[PDB]
# Entry
Amino acid sequence: VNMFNVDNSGKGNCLYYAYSISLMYYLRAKNNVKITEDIFNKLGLKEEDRARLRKLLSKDPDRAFTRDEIKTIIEPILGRATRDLAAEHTKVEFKSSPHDTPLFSSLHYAVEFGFKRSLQINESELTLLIDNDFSNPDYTEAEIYKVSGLLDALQEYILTRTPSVIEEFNRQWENKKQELKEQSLTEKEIQVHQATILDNILRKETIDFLLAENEKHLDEYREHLRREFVWGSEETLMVLHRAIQGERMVRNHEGRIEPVYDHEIILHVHRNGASPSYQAGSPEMILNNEGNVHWTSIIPDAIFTSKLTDKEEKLLDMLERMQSEYGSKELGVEKYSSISDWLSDLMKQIELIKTSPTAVTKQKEIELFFQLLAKATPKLASEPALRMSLGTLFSNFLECIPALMVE
Amino acid sequence: GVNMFNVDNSGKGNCLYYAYSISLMYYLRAKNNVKITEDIFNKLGLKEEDRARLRKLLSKDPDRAFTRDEIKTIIEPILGRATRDLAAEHTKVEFKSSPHDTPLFSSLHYAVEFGFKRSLQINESELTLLIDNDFSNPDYTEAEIYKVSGLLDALQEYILTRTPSVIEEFNRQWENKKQELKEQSLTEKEIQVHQATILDNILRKETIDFLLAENEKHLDEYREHLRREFVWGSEETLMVLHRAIQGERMVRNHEGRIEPVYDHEIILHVHRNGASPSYQAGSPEMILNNEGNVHWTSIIPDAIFTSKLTDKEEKLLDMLERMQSEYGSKELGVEKYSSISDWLSDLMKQIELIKTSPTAVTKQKEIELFFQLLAKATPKLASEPALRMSLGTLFSNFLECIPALMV
Amino acid sequence: MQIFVKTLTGKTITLEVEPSDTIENVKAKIQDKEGIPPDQQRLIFAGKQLEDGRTLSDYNIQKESTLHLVLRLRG
Amino acid sequence: MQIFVKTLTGKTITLEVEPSDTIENVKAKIQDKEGIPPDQQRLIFAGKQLEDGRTLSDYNIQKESTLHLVLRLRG
# Structure
């Protein structure tokens, strides 16, 4: 049950490495070439990078990506591309509609708290209309508060703008009082009307702070998210997935807003290996968080399944590369003229071990395998590099013996 | 009204150290002891010119609070950096004295034990079972060490590197302990406790070795992180700092028992959002108040300071001093007074002459002279909107302390 | 009236609500589009402490506002 | 055996304990010298979750170890 798991090198780039690996497995399963190129367009990939990734997506869908393929092509190309896209679409969403943004909803908590404190230092009774002691962790652990110096700048901004807030509040309540001339307001009712007016002023204050001096602080958040090795949080993993799918909120014939996608991809988030307790979809991408310090990739069974262990994949990939490096050489032994025909026969013999039914039959395929290794030994140790290749090949084999012995 | 005197600071990121220094300067003036004052100055490494400025501030009438200008131009520039330096440096001093006793070690080891659990399992070692740790305890994860940029990245590469040697070191020591318990028949329960202890002790040295390795690279990173301008101070470093300021030393005895020894004992308390602790401790000499995990301020105990101005009087002085730095340099060509600051200086002296004047008849004539000082500057200070309003606000403040001034 | 919420699945869903709906009913509707039980939802909007028993109109939440589900996970 | 703990008052105190003493007993001893009631003590040592019901010897807390009271306050 969605139990593959694939790690990454992450030196702080884990979210984006893990997203990239999860995505490339998805893109290969969804064999569609217009999905693949559309995602590449969103990521702004240049053509030589697209060529390298397309060659990886051509790989046999029943064989996993190797550790070297992940470390040398997938993480260097897509790690930066997804990080860039997530930081940039964070700003895009804010410019599109600032109030709908996680940045606004999370930073506004500090803004309201600060205005409570600043209003009280300024001896204004508006400080009473706010309840906020800046203790709610649902807000305080957002990424915006981990930006260096941001709360310092937010405090001098709020101290700057408090008197204008007081005057603007008075303006709108004078207008609201005269709009409610003919109604008889209880003092609790007047307090709800006032708290609402102050609320709306403060909401614009949060957005204006981010936008001030041509979007200085908004840009600081983008550049923070974009800095190499900065730890990704799930807020921006989520911005990133909205961007990759091409999600747009669009108004329709009746005037109702509904989400529109270019390419829908079902994403789930797991914690410490555990799937959610509740029933959602059959996911196409799964990202796994480990103890709030690391991110990894869980590959759904419907999206790829190989019947080799990661050690078994390592052994067979190494044999295929031995077959490409030495295969043309001569191996004057028996029927085998090539070393490549010998290596192919090694590959088939290892699979015959894997599929052999019981321990007694596995033992005889193991015996035939050692005799295959024996047949080539006279000629294969009078070659320098290939004797070294035989040794590592053998140790790789020993590493998959626990897996091979299961049948 | 047990302790309601609050004194703020300008803190941009330096609230802690500003607040500590203000709290300390009020203490040193209250304890008019010249060798307590000079020993703390020596601990802070102050040069003689800075000691001179601070000693002149300690000369101030003990019944008058320090003004914002004294605080902003004398106390925080000198003592803010000095206390920050001492707090960062004594953190390393304590670590070099006895690393296991330090808050740095006790807090960072949590991540070290967690990481070694994960790496041991990546290495398919059963030692991963001897650890219970999911890095979820906020008592540890909120330590300052985890806010140092990249430290956990570096810790992750150290742990993954050092895991095989840890496994081999465990095996040697467990072999030795089995041969030491040859003659006993240990259950599965006892053997697991023995193994956990051996691994525990090895991992503890791993934490110290990480900090000490490569000429104390990571230990120095923590010291300079704490020392960087505007970095938010945590209460861990407040306590390190107060240990340093008091000259606390843990010293061993004739009988061999350790007891704390101080140069100068000072009772420090920490308040949260203005509220004293629910429980009864001492009557404190310094109080540091934390506000919503974003600001630090200074509460002055009544036993240390008492102002004998009514607050109507204190507001009038503060407003005059704040006229003096905002407008003081502007020209006011009126008789002696060239600057507006020359005029404000004489206004301040005239209010003190009113207060100390002996009877109501003599007070009335000092009040009359105060009005003639206002008369001399009114033409030119009503020749400007902002200064006209300040002259008006000054006049209203003065009228409100007339009942206090007439006593 | 419509309101929006960003999911834990990299998408945005829409809810039909009234200003008088309690936060509890909003969470029930979220449970009815996502899978999350209400007591597992960490619901966020404009720094407000959305108490289960108080209402959208108590929090000055107007039409087409966007709330956010958070896990506050890092790595 | 002696044990040490860093206070919330910028000092260090010492306790006399035995390896069999529980964390609960240590917290009561801390209440004796400081003022903190046990349920307000956030006590930490070498990454160990000091559960009230387990003992110093359970956590391999040896002679002259230093524990720490924390408030985790910032500014």
